[PDB]
Amino acid sequence: RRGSGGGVCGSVWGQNDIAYRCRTCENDPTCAICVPCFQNGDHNSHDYSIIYTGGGCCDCGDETAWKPDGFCSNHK
Amino acid sequence: RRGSGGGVCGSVWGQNDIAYRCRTCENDPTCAICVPCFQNGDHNSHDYSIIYTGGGCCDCGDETAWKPDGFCSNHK
Ligand SMILES: [Mg+2]
Ligand SMILES: [Zn+2]
Ligand SMILES: [Zn+2]
Ligand SMILES: [Zn+2]
Ligand SMILES: [Zn+2]
Ligand SMILES: [Zn+2]
Ligand SMILES: [Zn+2]
């Protein structure tokens, strides 16, 4: 199966790449979205943080990993 | 175990690699098959599209991801 199937970002991170955690939007504490997806969505007043990913894939557009209100303009 | 052969393709994609979505053959909207397997199969009149994968692996030969009549000639 493909990582961007079903309208999901799936941008792939290297081990030391930064991304965003958003405690307001996440399904669980391992979820995260890429900086572009964060910047093209609405997380005003959310409890978000820049994190080091340890690799992985962006969850934006995946409703089983991230609340849809937290999707960016390209995956909403 | 082996990655390919044994009636399974398993080709692994990078983030930006293209592949084929075939809505006629897919088990679900996140499935995809690699360009060689698409070109070695029968998708005449199927509703297929070239897509960007976001990584992942080819579903050709995996009956839980892809209808067998959409398997290429090399993965049964
Ligand atoms: Mg036709
Ligand atoms: Zn993203
Ligand atoms: Zn997004
Ligand atoms: Zn948020
Ligand atoms: Zn293949
Ligand atoms: Zn094949
Ligand atoms: Zn097909």
Tokens representing A45 are 């007043």
Tokens representing A22 are 């958003």
Q: Please identify which residue in the block is written with the tokens 């390209």.
A: A74
Going from the Cα of B53 to the center of ligand 7, the distance in angstroms, rounded, reads 17
In this complex, the residue of B14, B15, B65 whose CB is nearest that of residue A1 is B65
Q: For residue B8, what are the contacts with CB-CB under 8 A and spacing of at least 6? A: B60, B61, B62, B75
Q: Three-state DSSP class for A36?
A: helix
Q: Give Cα separations from A2 to A43, A73, B30 (angstroms).
A: 28, 21, 6
Report CB contact under 8 Å: B55, A12: yes
In this complex, the residue of B14, B15, B30 whose CB is nearest that of residue A5 is B30
Tokens representing A76 are 């909403």
For residue A16, is it left (φ>0), alpha (ψ between -120 and 50) or beta? alpha
Going from the Cα of B70 to the center of ligand 7, the distance in angstroms, rounded, reads 5
Q: Catalogue the E-assigned strands of B1-76.
A: 12-13, 18-22, 48-52, 56-57
Rg (CA), chain A: 11
Q: Please identify which residue in the block is written with the tokens 């997380």.
A: A43
Resolution in A: 1.6
